[model samples]
Target chain A: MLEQPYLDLAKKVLDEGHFKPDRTHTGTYSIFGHQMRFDLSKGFPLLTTKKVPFGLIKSELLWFLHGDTNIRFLLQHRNHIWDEWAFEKWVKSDEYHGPDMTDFGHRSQKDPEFAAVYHEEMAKFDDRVLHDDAFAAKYGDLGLVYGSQWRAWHTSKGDTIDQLGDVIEQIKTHPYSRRLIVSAWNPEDVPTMALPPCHTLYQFYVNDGKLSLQLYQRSADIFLGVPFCIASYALLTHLVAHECGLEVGEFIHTFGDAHLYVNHLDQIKEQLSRTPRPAPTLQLNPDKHDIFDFDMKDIKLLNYDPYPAIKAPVAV
Target chain B: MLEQPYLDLAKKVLDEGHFKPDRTHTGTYSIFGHQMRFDLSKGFPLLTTKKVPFGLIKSELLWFLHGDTNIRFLLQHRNHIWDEWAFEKWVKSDEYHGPDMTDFGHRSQKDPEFAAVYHEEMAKFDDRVLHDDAFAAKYGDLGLVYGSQWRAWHTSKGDTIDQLGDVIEQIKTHPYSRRLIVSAWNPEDVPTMALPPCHTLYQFYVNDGKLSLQLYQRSADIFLGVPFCIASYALLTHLVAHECGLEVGEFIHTFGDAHLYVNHLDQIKEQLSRTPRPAPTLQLNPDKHDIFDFDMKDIKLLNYDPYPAIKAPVAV
Candidate 1:
């Protein structure tokens, strides 16, 4: 029952969503506005229908909390979720003379030979980013990503604002303040960005000794992205509540264009056929009050029994 | 049946909302995340339970469309809704030598003597802002309000981005774009603002040749503000759709902290007891294509038969 809301959303979209074209050239069954709420008091919201990679979620969230825009931090944790963006930058640079990697994302998926070459190039890119400081500083940095947007928002006066830190401070000092918000969508950067933020803006609400967070995600890839988004924000809510010495309330995921790719229809249907099990519970290192200091070992998932992972092609 | 969603929101908040303290020191019955959808094709969403001032809403929206941050335009339309904010600025300036207007908002509500003086001073302030060019330029400009944020979002490179214009352009060319968004929350300016935007960010979705909009409002004053917000954004959806040569679809209003002030309990209850009426229909001038070029006489509300207006104290 903890995950029924998610399943219901899938079913609703399958039944009533409109067929629309998207930027990735992959069409989708889309809905205009949708809201899903996960109450942390019951249990963590990691999907039990299919296995979600909690480790990658942990590392990526910690990377964001650290305000590190470089992919080196994520690579150090053996997490490659963000490597594609950095690799895109590296392969496009003058320093890279290894191979032609244009249109690699869609190309690799289609041609087996190109997939092999792309994998090799990505491996080399990751190794270099881990070892070479100069290369990492030059090509590995994702300018204006969530970490930078959340912590070092650039002001016109040549200064930066720490939105996350300010919000945390407000939660501690002024818990009832309605202005606790952090935005990742910068209009100045969206035009030039390869992929603008999907999780655009988030707001926090504090009441009755509990902290709740609501995210306004502009576009959602429901099958591949929504599960991870739910668990990720839920974990962030737990972490922030832990730091503020409050209880967790809810993680509300609100979407503008929530959709399932035409390719992922079968995968989602398979997932929906399976009944949802009890949700997993999250454990954080109690001694680590500062969210930025959290490492991989500091977070844990307990009682996470789920069906086997279902493979689906990413629309990107 | 069309307006039942709003009535349901009120009933839900009253029955299950948490009693929480807020910024204005007037406590609220608060709920964390809520959403309501109104199909614009059915009818305009102005509350049938009470009389809403469409004239003020029209002038304010037109001012925003024209990218005018100064209240002089609003004053010219005989709309004094924004007079207090500009008046507060003038009364606090060094040039002001009038009676002390300290805590004018709360003090005026309590003391009839102070209310008379405050109203007199406010009338003088409005007159001067309308008449004196230099004075209006100095004090009447409410910088970084909706008009500024929507039209001229300041960037770090000494430039401004026309977000509303760009969104409209995207709606025309790439009608199915998920990134058609306009944000009013600028983190660099929020800390110093007198009132941060409550209607924070909005996204536009075009599907089946009809345009839909979703607004993410961080904070909502349910009794006093939600009605106006619903109609204001509904009208916006109509205008954008009209300009883009599409039919209006739905207006999805999502909220973070939606609440009712303790002082407005009776007023809201009275509203809930009243029966709903036929919804109003909006009329836009077919001759005028550009929303910015339209004037007061171009927009009209027809068949807006509703219950009498309800009065409540504004918790400023």
Candidate 2:
């Protein structure tokens, strides 16, 4: 019942959401302006309907917290969630003499032969990124991604602002401050970004010794992305509250255009058929005070029981 | 019944909202996340429970559309909503020779004598700003306000981006775009800003040949500000939909830290007691296609019958 909001959202969209074409040429059933609240005081909001890779979420978030834009750290943790973004850059570079992989995302999904080559090339790219320091520094870095936006926001005065660090500091000193916000949707950078921030901005609210976070995500891929995002921010709230010596309150996820890609409809329907199980509890190491200092070992997911992972193609 | 959602919000906050101290030192009964939807196709969302001044909302929004940050425009239009922000600047400046206006907002509220002086000083400041070009340029401008952030967002490359204009273009050409967003929250500028953006970021979604908008406001003064905001964004949705040659859909107002100020609780209750009336309809000039080119004369509010205004102190 803890994750019923998510299931209800999927059902609502399926029933009454407007059909619209999207950027990825994949049609969607979208319902604009939706909110789902997860009270962390009850349990961690990891979706119990389907298997969500908590390890990948942990590595990616830890990578973001470190302000490390390079995919090297993710690769080292054996997390390939962000490899596609980096691989896209590597394959498009002048130095890349590998087989032609143009529109590889769609091509791989359609043709089995091309998918094999694409897989091989991506593996090669990931191997080089892990071992070759020079290659990793050059091609592995995703400039102006979440880590860059949250940690070193570029200013007109030729300086960087640490938005997340400042927010944490505000949470400690000015707990009730309403201006505790970190924005990733930079108007300056959106034009050039390959994939603009889906989790565009977030705000932290403090009340009754509890810390709550609200994320305003502009575009949500409900089937594949929303589950990961929910747990990721939930963990972030827990970690921040732990460091700030406050109780975890809620993670309120607000969306602009929340949609299920037409291709993922069956997957979502399958997910909806399964009843929600009790949400698992998140355990953060008490020794880890600073969120930035947290490693994979510092965070733990307890008693996460779920249905089998349902495969769905990402909308590129 | 159209504005029942708003009344429900106030009642909910009063009943179960958290009690928290805020920046104004005026405590609040607050809720972390809340959303209200006003179907623009049904009626304009100007609160019928209390007579909301549609004129002030119109002038303020028009000034923002023009990218005019100076209070001089508002003053010329007989709108005093932004006079305090500009007056605060002038009173704190080295050139000002007025009586010490330290903490004038609260002081004026408590002391009648101080309130009179403050009003006199504000009038003089407004007159000077209206008449003198040099003084207005120097002191009247509240730089980096909504207008500046909405229209000319300052970039890291020593240039400014026209976010509103760009969004308008995207709406026309790429109607199905999930990224039709205009953000007022700039992390680079927030730390030094006197009052950071409250209507932080907004996204536009086009579906079924209708345009809808969702605003992510970080902090909301529900009793005083929410009524104006609901009307403001609903008007905005209508304007944008008109310009884009689409029917108006819903205006979704989502919030973080939506609160009723402790002092304004009685005022809100008075509003809640009043029965709802038929919502007014907004009329935008069919001859005018561009939102920026339109003026106060072009927009009209029809059949806006409402209960008497309930006066309340702004939290400042």
Candidate 3:
């Protein structure tokens, strides 16, 4: 029942959600607070109800682990999840000379012709980011991103602190410490960023030699983002536990504003229709000790029998 | 039954808590994650299970609002809650020439004679903070505290950002904005802080012309600190709501590690034994719209009838 908590959360939100307009202008059926825990002892919490691409989650997480903010690394792995954010930065820059890319997100969704043009432009942008070192160096690097915030936090003094690295060390050294926390919600950088971290902070807890993690996400897109987020964090928890030489305890996901986009109401209800199967097990390289050195080939999903992927329009 | 959530939480932790060692070397019956919501429309959420001191909560809150990190203001109001933290710094510094104040917190608790001497020393420190400007400036100022973090967060660019002030303005202008949040967990400062903020970050949500707030606290000291923390944040939400010209909504409290100290099990059981009464009503000055200008006389608590205060030892 590792994935039961997530489905229950969606059902609860849909049944009793308040209608609220969000930043994306696609209205949301939102609730204030919610908590869900997935026990890693049972299995990896990859959703059995929907087909979640484990590959994307693995590469993205590894990118974060490497503290690599450059989209080049992601593009090399064929993970285009963060391409839009990097593309947006490039098209907005003075160096770009192209067709008007203003309101491209909405326009691409509404008009098929513009969608084609936008796709072509985005593909070209991605190609440039992947192939050209100088161009990628200039536009592909997303400064102050999760990778930067987690691994290289800028201090008031000129030094940079490796928060994620430090937390891992703390876990290995002081398993019983309550102060083991990593926060990505930097107020100094939030105002200027394209999107502030939804996964605001996380803390580690240990008892009886088992490692547990709790993530405080400020906002959640329940239908699209949550499933991926759940799987991602579960995998992360497993990795951290493996590195620290401890048993996996639980991955607790807490939300401040948990919401489902109005457009995805049908998708959510359809999701709630299917009964969840047993969760899949994740297998990491037994030989690898450090989470930082984990590659896509080092991780494997065993017997992941998930239902067909449901299609829903993303809220951009 | 407005406080039933809190009671249930304590009972739950009592029955099914993990034994974990904490920073203070005091063991805790702890839970990883928990959430509770209080309807502000019903009444103010000052705890009715025990007599919580409203004066200390008020003055301490106002002190934070004024961006005063100095203990002088708190000492002037006879609010000695933060005295120990500041006093620790003084006793550890070279300037301290008094009788060996080492381990004053625990020693004072165990020995009556040493407690008398510690009290005398603390009283002298408090007096100096209140009356002597130079002495207070040297020894009484608690740098990088909540006030400093909220109001004057230092930037890497050699600048300061008024996070609380900016957030208040955001609430006034766009009450519907989900991004209206104030965070005190600056990664740059957490390492150097005596204690990082437990009430790490909070978000404001508006619905049906009423304002609600959700706080993401990373840690909780359930018996002693939680009661005070609850009242403090509830008051903060009310003040912000009043300033925004909106009716009060629910105050949702969320936690990362919510725990009861080993010494607090009996006290918590005693608290759970009592039935709760109707919550007290808080009265803020009608003429004063700004939270920063409010004084002790401006805030009042009406009919906070409750059982006698329960005495419990603090972890530190």
Candidate 4:
């Protein structure tokens, strides 16, 4: 069990570290620590917090596994979150004059059902291109690089390669292979990506016959975002472990500036106040391991009880 | 003269996008256009190339300003890169332990230098009290958070008081003041200093009418680090003009990771072939700003040539 001493330290840093002290958009003091160690002797590590919505985690991980760059597929299950930014904000905003009116109009009036169909179709395309390095090299959005290289990687520096898939494989084949690391930090390519890698890179290790993943997060916002991060990668580990034929292990996260949103301070306290139920369990598609095959439905977390949901406006 | 394109984008980001990319380190990645409109009429946009030392930028900054952590500060300068590990190795070495002193002073006294100073001086009650937070707060081993906070700051989560220091001043003297920014991203802090700041923090704006001032960096691993990142920050036109009493100006980077370590492949290729040239001069410490009270002498960029510096092995 995770001790409160560790929890207390994690909490105090947010409460009193003194630099940019304030609550987040949801009113949580900056920084929250949700850590758990998995016993390979056991099965997996998944959060059982109030309906962690394993469906979303599976789908997102599957989406990333397939190396799909677009969020269209995710809109169906989590529309309120996905649609506004990927399409509405990127294409139709008066703020951004995107691809052109034709592309813009096509996204809007094209059809709601069509949006789902388009998402499914894109998901298929993503699945096909992710694992095949040569295919990834060609039609793929730099594996894990997102769809940019495929759709709009400003090709001044070099060619695209499924960097993410390659690193994942490296992790499986060589756990202690000291060199198992990948960085999305192509300083040369910072200007091209719509955004640079925030979950910049990760490292892998194997111990007690279990596979573990550690991420070196360049930055972190404590509120309105961290929960997704925890789920997203947690799902990734499950899928990877299945592929490697290893048990799911610990997910160690080392952050640069792990802070709570200026507005979310109170909600965090509320959540902390709520009793922490037993950790939820995650089940993965037994056959899933290739990055591309994992889909949203394939990931599952069951039985969670805690506080009611807390909603906050997006500061962006 | 500041270019509006870049200035507005930088400002818009400062105002709206403080959180980081969610996946990486749970840090949100804020994407902003690098476009800047420097009205050479107003002042130089100064981002054509990032001219600053990042390693040294992270180091020296941490050493001087970050509350005098420890002599370990010297290590960020890469001065004693291998000494600690070397000393640790010595204890296990057969040569040192096997043949030396038939009966060692003590098992812990393995490294005589460390044992002598550490056991005698560092462990002293008075020394602990005297150095507790004054020097140890910023540079001590494995707890200090530097670069990440500077760039991926979870606003209001930490003390980040430095961020707010000049807000009032910026608002008060906007039209007349030349902005001057300062950052301390201690690099040596990485191995021993807790969390070394990679994107060390920075101040903005003004030398004579020309903008300028010193930036203290804690570390600079030229290869893995970002000289361009510094350029990105140092080049902001609106920020310099808005905060400083002067117009859009120049950036002076003082680095800690000032050397090129042997391992960097891409960076060396990128920077090594470039022709060396005398860095453009920045004159400050004008009568108005004052030597004590501010411009040319206060603003100085000594002999920084365009060519990449000599390389060495990075101890970390």
> Considering every candidate listed, which one attains the maximal lDDT?
1
Per-residue lDDT of B99-182 in model 1, one digit per residue for the tens?
A: 989999988988899989889988888989889999999998988889989999999888989999999998888998888999
Q: What C-alpha RMSD separates each model from the true structure?
A: 1.0, 1.2, 1.4, 19.5
lDDT of 2 at A227: 91
**Residue runs of model 3 more than 4 Å from their true location after superposition:** none
- Give the distance in Å from residue A94's predicted Cα in candidate 3 to where it truly belongs: 3.8
iRMSD for every model: 0.8, 0.9, 1.4, 17.7
Q: Show how many residue pairs clash in every candidate, following the order shown.
A: 0, 0, 0, 121
Local accuracy of candidate 4 as per-residue lDDT tens digits, A80-130 = 233332433333435433233333325534357555654553444445443
Pairs that collide in candidate 1 are: none
Evaluation by DockQ, superior candidate among 1 and 4: 1
Clashing pairs in 2: none
Q: Is the docking of candidate 3 incorrect, acceptable, medium or high quality?
A: medium
Interface RMSD of 1: 0.8
lDDT against true structure, model 4: 0.41
Best by TM-score: 1
Off by over 4 Å in 4: A1-10, A19-51, A76-80, A88-158, A192-194, A287-291, B1-316
Ranking by lDDT: 1, 2, 3, 4
